[PDB]
Ligand binder design. Structure first.
Ligand SMILES: *C(=C)C1=C(C)[C@@H](Cc2[nH]c(/C=C3N=C(/C=C4\NC(=O)[C@H](C)[C@H]4CC)C(C)=C\3CCC(=O)O)c(CCC(=O)O)c2C)NC1=O
Ligand SMILES: *[C@@H](C)C1=C(C)C(=O)N[C@H]1Cc1[nH]c(/C=C2\N=C(C[C@H]3NC(=O)C(CC)=C3C)C(C)=C2CCC(=O)O)c(CCC(=O)O)c1C
Ligand SMILES: *[C@@H](C)[C@H]1/C(=C/C2=NC(=C\c3[nH]c(C[C@H]4NC(=O)C(C=C)=C4C)c(C)c3CCC(=O)O)/C(CCC(=O)O)=C2C)NC(=O)[C@@H]1C
Ligand SMILES: *[C@H](C)[C@H]1/C(=C/C2=NC(=C\c3[nH]c(C[C@H]4NC(=O)C(C=C)=C4C)c(C)c3CCC(=O)O)/C(CCC(=O)O)=C2C)NC(=O)[C@@H]1C
Ligand SMILES: *[C@H](C)[C@H]1/C(=C/C2=NC(=C\c3[nH]c(C[C@H]4NC(=O)C(C=C)=C4C)c(C)c3CCC(=O)O)/C(CCC(=O)O)=C2C)NC(=O)[C@@H]1C
Ligand SMILES: *[C@H](C)[C@H]1/C(=C/C2=NC(=C\c3[nH]c(C[C@H]4NC(=O)C(C=C)=C4C)c(C)c3CCC(=O)O)/C(CCC(=O)O)=C2C)NC(=O)[C@@H]1C
Ligand SMILES: *[C@H](C)[C@H]1/C(=C/C2=NC(=C\c3[nH]c(C[C@H]4NC(=O)C(C=C)=C4C)c(C)c3CCC(=O)O)/C(CCC(=O)O)=C2C)NC(=O)[C@@H]1C
Ligand SMILES: C=CC1=C(C)[C@@H](Cc2[nH]c(/C=C3N=C(/C=C4\NC(=O)[C@H](C)[C@H]4CC)C(C)=C\3CCC(=O)O)c(CCC(=O)O)c2C)NC1=O
Ligand SMILES: C=CC1=C(C)[C@@H](Cc2[nH]c(/C=C3N=C(/C=C4\NC(=O)[C@H](C)[C@H]4CC)C(C)=C\3CCC(=O)O)c(CCC(=O)O)c2C)NC1=O
Ligand SMILES: C=CC1=C(C)[C@@H](Cc2[nH]c(/C=C3N=C(/C=C4\NC(=O)[C@H](C)[C@H]4CC)C(C)=C\3CCC(=O)O)c(CCC(=O)O)c2C)NC1=O
Ligand SMILES: C=CC1=C(C)[C@@H](Cc2[nH]c(/C=C3N=C(/C=C4\NC(=O)[C@H](C)[C@H]4CC)C(C)=C\3CCC(=O)O)c(CCC(=O)O)c2C)NC1=O
Ligand SMILES: C=CC1=C(C)[C@@H](Cc2[nH]c(/C=C3N=C(/C=C4\NC(=O)[C@H](C)[C@H]4CC)C(C)=C\3CCC(=O)O)c(CCC(=O)O)c2C)NC1=O
Ligand SMILES: C=CC1=C(C)[C@@H](Cc2[nH]c(/C=C3N=C(/C=C4\NC(=O)[C@H](C)[C@H]4CC)C(C)=C\3CCC(=O)O)c(CCC(=O)O)c2C)NC1=O
Ligand SMILES: C=CC1=C(C)[C@@H](Cc2[nH]c(/C=C3N=C(/C=C4\NC(=O)[C@H](C)[C@H]4CC)C(C)=C\3CCC(=O)O)c(CCC(=O)O)c2C)NC1=O
Lengths: 164, 177, 238, 73, 164, 177, 177, 177
């Protein structure tokens, strides 16, 4: 995982040095910002079945061509496999809010994604509409706090920038 | 590798659940003792030069058999490597106290080391007496109960941070002996 | 007189210009870094076990004439392949000269200094692909898997480059067999103190040069450091 | 020589005496070596850039018909 | 130089990756604890000439043998150079009170210092008495504030840990 | 590298003076809006992969000679390399915007890149335009006048940091010119 | 300068042999069709002015990004400096066709044209198209196969001089790339 | 060279747009605040000879190794050149402040100044100090805080022009580094 903690230990291991006050002050950033990045942690974990349902069809609302045969949305268990993938992703976005960095998204969702989606005929532009619909439907004082809405959206468009 | 914040991720990924109100009491407490934790690493980075010499000469005062000819401190080349690797495992446990987990020990310190030390002629009895004596030197710096050097700090109980490093030293002193 | 393009008879401006002196300072740091990286091999008065040329009297002189033809093929590179050799050796030396801004400063100017350090720093902590013999076929098939992907830019589009080539003359490549077969045995018959210094430095080499905070690539390198020492720069086509 | 003279006495001397202003140019291009005979191009692409204007400079060494003038011999 | 910024900008450049939300979070630690070491800086800069009058003779307090003929501190102008020598090291720890790392130490104060003192016969084991005298000479509500003293002492015994 | 903190250190190292209270008010005001530096650079990195598609295709639709046959953006390997260095320059400008100084720019990116584009036949006159479109895009995201995406920031003034990135893309545009 | 009569005489001077009738068979054949070659060079020179307008405006209509801003034929100074070197290439291959040897071409026009077009930023891929249309205009004028203006000539084959002038234009093309 | 008006014209020429109403706001305030620019240059060029002697006497008293036998400011043949290049830079910075663009500074002076001062043996780390003293005088004379001479000025603010000339001496400082 790549987090705030995991970077400075690898930087000190590269130099062959003890954790000095440059590495010590990086975890000070996990004191003021972890009050806001963990404010949006349980809002996703306590409402994970609501965000998957009315953003997973927003994939299919923009791309309704998948219901024709030969495509990926051609039968119901493929759609039942389709809602699992954005439920996998928002679990990983919740996994990167509680870790501080972008580790669990990188180690488990993005690495190797560009090789599977091309051979299995899965459009990554159809992935990115379900991700980006949760970004602009997010209200800043209603869904979460003000600084948590900046924080949760910043991990969200990293995945948009990962797939495109 | 892992850490403390990544441990509750892979504990939640072991069943593919989320991280909600059940697993967050260990992690919402972790930011509260973070200023205890950042003051614990600052205590151990201050004094690493003597506490390896406290350990590798305390190994001498109970075991002079390596300065006996044919030992492992007879050579000045070998006595540097006992001082160089006396602090690397001290550098790795200070990595583990900053990480909140001993994940960096079982790949960068522990794994390979027993197969290393058979191919060097390393006395395995010297391994356990070196780490356990500097274990008491480590918690004396953490609980500020070092009887020839004191330090200024903020008041409060700190034995939870003294027990966390006490769970690290018996890991590495076990398999290589 | 006017220029050589019209009505002259001998080539002019034979003078040490700025680019020749820039090549002249960079060749001299190449003879200082390769001096200093050989100091760890020959640290006492005797030559070590791995500073050897060959075994056959005709094979020790064939190591130089191969390597004198090897350094011509780096000079014979294309303009795109020289520029990709230029910046990738810049990147792999900042990872090498890690904690110093002054040591980072010198390599950004001098370009043959970058080739000199990251070839010698691979051979100072012996993270080369020749010096490691894996202990079993478990570690060998991990080591044989990674270098075939490193051989996959010897043929970039299925046609071979010049950098992977080892035969330059008639009957040349058979000496290149037995020089590495003897190098494989001397790495296997090396000292027991050196070979466990090799595996720990090579697993520390791959975690900073190619893993970059990845938990999976660090885990295979800590399980198989023989595959970590087979990992090299991609400027080398071989 | 009017645009390298500093004061107006010097540009008055260059006007009345036209043989003086010819060797005034031959004063300034020898104390500052800006001749072709001191020109050393540092590289081959600057050697060719020098020869791009010598072929214009040899074109006034012949007349407009194409006969070689007596100025270049 | 090693700083809070210059570690994570060099760590993200190792993979060729953008500044992630982990990397902005480490900069947030370099704001709140930056002001702790900042008021230690100009308080040291306003009082630098009086520390070296007390740290100068402290090396000759417990080692009075430096002024013997035959050693490298025998005449008066070498003691004036010895007073100049510690003022460079107190200028260097004033610099890491600004940058928050060990940047102006490990290339300007330690790098090469193990060999210029072994070749010009200046005892490093006696030289560290000058810096470590200033470590316990620290009145944490009278010198400066409280949280400046937990890091200014940490820079000084890092320099004890670097030479020995 | 260096940053804005170490820039006044190496300027004071040339005079060997302690940085007192007089010159640190440039850096006392710098840590006052340290949230503003993170609130500006987060707008760039969130739209980083969409800014280089906005700029390279803006370079093609203004100068269509690159997609002529034989041209610099005709072979599909070459367009992959042109989009490769679109996000390298955008990485290194956002490195310098985060650090506050451009000292990471002319040693790891701009060092030797002028003669590299000359030796590769890269048309540098259209390569200014691919940088200058990123200059007009980074100044739009920071002051939040980007006319297809607005973000949520606290109200205030950020023209001092709008010109911080506008002096950095023009440092790229003046070095490869 | 080495012409066709003087190309062979430095080949004999590499071995210091008297040139004899075994070697004049290439030369007496060359002097026999010399009225055809003077009928060949005159067909180029008498159409030489529009032939560079036939080619450079052929380069613009194939690739319209040269007159685009950022193109290297954009401004009115640069199109004048391209039509100036449109006719230098046609002047220097009429110097090699009249002399029967391309050793007036490889040293008085292209000894250093590669690094000149590199260091100026002149695109190499479009200067091939500037000279290859003049390759196809030479062989239409040598063979009298121009579809808009045919010139009066004596009858007979002229296919060797069309192959010779096309073997001069590729040496322009293989050096400036 | 180019100036401040021609900087936005060549920026509007690369896109081939007309000079509109949004890019003319940088120029139509450059006129009204340009009456303070003539008051900014006239404070610098009136004190021009005594500024370049203030700097190199500060360079000798800070770096006394230049007046060593064999040093780089030893003879009067060499000290006249160091007072020459001290005022060539102040001549070209006063062209850059007067025009408002740095274009005239870094094509007549700074292009090739780095490898010149290598090829002469001029020390870089003391000529950085020499131009930085001239930086400190120009930011004193423009806002009239020069502590032994005040000059007559209308009341107002000039920290825009004080930062512009501070952005020009380190362009010399970035060139010779
Ligand atoms: C073709 C000739 C042509 C284009 C293609 C297009 C490119 C272009 N766009 C701008 C201005 C902006 N570009 C932006 C980039 C994007 N817009 C987005 O919202 C996403 C993140 C991204 C695309 C994926 C942005 C944000 C701006 C600012 C305005 C805004 O709010 O959108 C320019 C610059 C124009 C100039 O230099 O004045 C160009 C060239 N324009 C074309 O003409
Ligand atoms: C480039 C790095 C190569 C790849 C990929 C590969 O599979 N082999 C490399 C190039 C290459 N060489 C040959 C032919 C020979 N190669 C020889 C070298 C082997 N001998 C050694 O001592 C060692 C070190 C372990 C090696 C690899 C030899 C000998 C030959 C035969 C030469 C001869 O007998 O004349 C080939 C195959 C092409 C062919 O014509 O055989 C390739 C791809
Ligand atoms: C100009 C570029 C913008 C703008 C910027 C402002 N941002 C302000 C405050 C602010 N921003 C953040 C988030 C920032 N801090 C972090 O630690 C990280 C990431 C790890 C980020 C992205 C914070 C925490 C704050 C402080 C207030 C808060 O809690 O939200 C701000 C107010 C000044 C200040 O208090 O710092 C401004 C003006 N605002 C604009 O209008 C333009 C578009
Ligand atoms: C037990 C192991 C120790 C001890 C630990 C405590 N430390 C406490 C507070 C504390 N320490 C620091 C500085 C530290 N935090 C950082 O972010 C950095 C560097 C960037 C460092 C060095 C701070 C800021 C604090 C918070 C209070 C303050 O502002 O000073 C502490 C108090 C409890 C708590 O704050 O949670 C304890 C118990 N104290 C001891 O006595 C033993 C030796
Ligand atoms: C794209 C907007 C440009 C353009 C780009 C091309 N670049 C080509 C090769 C290349 N690009 C870079 C830049 C970049 N890579 C780095 O590592 C660093 C600094 C650390 C930078 C700034 C380099 C170094 C190279 C050479 C190495 C390589 O080939 O990868 C390229 C390919 C040329 C070819 O295939 O012959 C292109 C097309 N060209 C354009 O038309 C626009 C202006
Ligand atoms: C037009 C079809 C080309 C093109 C031409 C340009 N050439 C420019 C300058 C230039 N051209 C030459 C060629 C030629 N002139 C000679 O005197 C000789 C040898 C005796 C040759 C082969 C030279 C040497 C030069 C440099 C010297 C000069 O200024 O004339 C030029 C001007 C560039 C500018 O003003 O920045 C242009 C546009 N460029 C093209 O894009 C097409 C392919
Ligand atoms: C003084 C601040 C320096 C220093 C100066 C020396 N420069 C020497 C020769 C020299 N200097 C320049 C720079 C300047 N003159 C120009 O005409 C222009 C541009 C129009 C500039 C920027 C040049 C070009 C030259 C070469 C010409 C010449 O021969 O004078 C010099 C003489 C070296 C010697 O005689 O051995 C000195 C001492 N050197 C220093 O140490 C300080 C830092
Ligand atoms: C024998 C053991 C063995 C390994 C340890 C890896 C190591 C490895 N990775 C890559 C190749 C790669 N490695 C990565 C790295 C990662 N990808 C991710 O999803 C993570 C974020 C990160 C791991 C931490 C990426 C992104 C590439 C593709 C781009 C590249 O060539 O670097 C390559 C080049 C050839 C290839 O593509 O396979 C190799 C040898 N591969 C192996 O065969
Ligand atoms: C973790 C993130 C998080 C959230 C996304 C919300 C959870 C949430 N609230 C709504 C539901 C809603 N959200 C809004 C809010 C808005 N609608 C607008 O048109 C305005 C732009 C904006 C106010 C700022 C409204 C008005 C509803 C009810 C209508 C609806 O969308 O069904 C929806 C979609 C419909 C539904 O299932 O109910 C979701 C997932 N709470 C959270 O904790
Ligand atoms: C045989 C020879 C021999 C020695 C060399 C010493 C070495 C030594 N020191 C300690 C014990 C210790 N050693 C240290 C280390 C240090 N103490 C300080 O005050 C400094 C900071 C630092 C020296 C640089 C510390 C902190 C303790 C814990 C007790 C304390 O000092 O307060 C112990 C463990 C005692 C035990 O548990 O039995 C030993 C063996 N003792 C010996 O018998
Ligand atoms: C031609 C240019 C050139 C360089 C750039 C340097 C780079 C360099 N330094 C060292 C060797 C060294 N380099 C350093 C320097 C440093 N180590 C640190 O921990 C600090 C962060 C940093 C100071 C900035 C030290 C202390 C050694 C000796 C021990 C070691 O290798 O770490 C070596 C190997 C030789 C040896 O083993 O001694 C090389 C190639 N040397 C050169 O010849
Ligand atoms: C620092 C001290 C130092 C040394 C002791 C020598 C090490 C050295 N290198 C080579 C000779 C070589 N060494 C390499 C280098 C490598 N080959 C690879 O596969 C890796 C990518 C890379 C590091 C291991 C290459 C490519 C050759 C030429 C071909 C070869 O014989 O392997 C030889 C000749 C014997 C032989 O290998 O056949 C020796 C003694 N060079 C040094 O710089
Ligand atoms: C977009 C703009 C554009 C152009 C400028 C031309 C450019 C051009 N001309 C020719 C081809 C030719 N070009 C000429 C040149 C000339 N012809 C004459 O009659 C004059 C003597 C002289 C101009 C003064 C000649 C002689 C040929 C051979 C065919 C012919 O015209 O008989 C060819 C190859 C065959 C062809 O497709 O025609 C091309 C691409 N074509 C274009 O598409
Ligand atoms: C050891 C030798 C030595 C010197 C000679 C002085 C030289 C000197 N003066 C200034 C600093 C300055 N120097 C000048 C220059 C001048 N003042 C004027 O009014 C005249 C025009 C001109 C003298 C003829 C100015 C205007 C300042 C700014 C402050 C001020 O004088 O008001 C600086 C930069 C700041 C500093 O580093 O202290 C230096 C090095 N200082 C030294 O350490």
């Amino acid at each position: 995982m790549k987090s705030v903690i995991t970077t400075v230990v690898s930087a000190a291991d590269a130099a062959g040095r003890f954790p000095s006050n440059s590495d010590l002050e990086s975890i000070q950033g996990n004191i003021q910002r972890s009050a806001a990045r963990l404010e949006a942690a349980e809002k996703l974990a306590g409402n994970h079945e609501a965000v998957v349902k009315e953003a997973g069809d927003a994939c299919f609302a923009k791309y309704a061509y998948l219901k024709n045969p030969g495509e990926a949305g051609e039968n119901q268990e493929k759609i039942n496999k389709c809602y699992r993938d954005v439920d996998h992703y928002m679990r990983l976005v919740n996994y990167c809010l509680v870790v501080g960095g972008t580790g669990p998204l990188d180690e488990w969702g993005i690495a190797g994604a560009r090789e599977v989606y091309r051979t299995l005929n899965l459009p990554t532009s159809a992935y990115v509409a379900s991700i980006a619909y949760t970004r602009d439907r997010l209200c800043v004082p209603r869904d979460m706090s003000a600084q948590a809405g900046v924080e949760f959206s910043a991990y969200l468009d990293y995945l948009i920038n990962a797939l495109s | 590798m892992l850490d403390a914040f990544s441990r509750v991720v892979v504990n939640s990924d072991a069943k593919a659940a989320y991280v909600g109100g059940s697993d967050l009491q260990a992690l919402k407490s972790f930011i509260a003792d973070g200023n205890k934790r950042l003051d614990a690493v600052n205590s151990i980075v201050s004094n690493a030069s003597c506490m390896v010499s406290d350990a590798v000469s305390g190994m001498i005062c109970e075991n002079p058999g390596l300065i006996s000819p044919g030992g492992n401190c007879y050579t000045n080349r070998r006595m540097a490597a006992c001082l160089r690797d006396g602090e690397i495992i001290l550098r790795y446990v200070s990595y583990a106290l900053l990480a909140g987990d001993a994940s960096v020990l079982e790949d960068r310190c522990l794994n390979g080391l027993k197969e290393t030390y058979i191919a060097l002629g390393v006395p395995t009895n010297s391994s356990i007496r070196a780490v356990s004596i500097m274990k008491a030197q480590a918690v004396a710096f953490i609980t500020n109960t070092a009887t020839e050097r004191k330090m200024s700090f903020a008041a409060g109980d700190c034995t939870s941070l003294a027990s966390e490093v006490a769970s690290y030293f018996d890991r590495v002193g076990a398999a290589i002996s | 007189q006017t220029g050589l393009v019209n009505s002259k008879f001998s080539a002019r401006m034979a003078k040490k210009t700025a680019k020749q002196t820039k090549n002249k300072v960079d060749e001299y740091m190449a003879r200082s870094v390769q001096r200093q990286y050989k100091q760890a091999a020959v640290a006492t008065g005797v030559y070590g076990t791995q500073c050897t040329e060959g075994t056959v009297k005709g094979a020790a002189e064939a190591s130089r004439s191969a390597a004198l033809s090897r350094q011509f093929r780096i000079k014979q590179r294309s303009a795109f392949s020289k520029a990709h050799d230029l910046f990738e050796f810049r990147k792999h030396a900042i990872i090498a000269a890690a904690g110093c801004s002054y040591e980072e400063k010198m390599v950004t100017r001098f370009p043959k200094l970058a080739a000199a350090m990251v070839l010698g720093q691979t051979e100072m902590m012996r993270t080369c692909s020749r010096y490691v013999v894996p202990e079993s076929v478990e570690e060998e098939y991990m080591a044989a898997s990674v270098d075939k992907q490193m051989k996959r830019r010897g043929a970039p589009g299925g046609v071979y480059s010049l950098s992977c080539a080892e035969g330059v003359a008639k009957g040349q490549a058979e000496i290149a067999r037995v020089s590495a077969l003897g190098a494989a045995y001397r790495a296997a018959s090396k000292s027991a103190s050196a070979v466990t210094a090799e595996r720990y430095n090579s697993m520390a080499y791959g975690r900073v040069h190619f893993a970059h905070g990845c938990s999976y690539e660090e885990q295979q390198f800590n399980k198989y450091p023989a595959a970590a020492a087979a990992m090299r720069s991609d400027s080398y086509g071989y | 020589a009017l645009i390298l003279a500093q004061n107006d006495h010097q540009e008055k001397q260059y006007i009345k005496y036209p043989k003086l202003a010819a060797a005034a140019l031959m004063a300034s291009t020898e104390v500052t070596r800006a001749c072709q005979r001191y020109a050393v191009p540092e590289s081959i692409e600057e050697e060719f850039l020098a020869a791009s204007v010598d072929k214009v400079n040899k074109m006034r060494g012949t007349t407009a018909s194409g006969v070689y003038k007596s100025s270049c011999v």
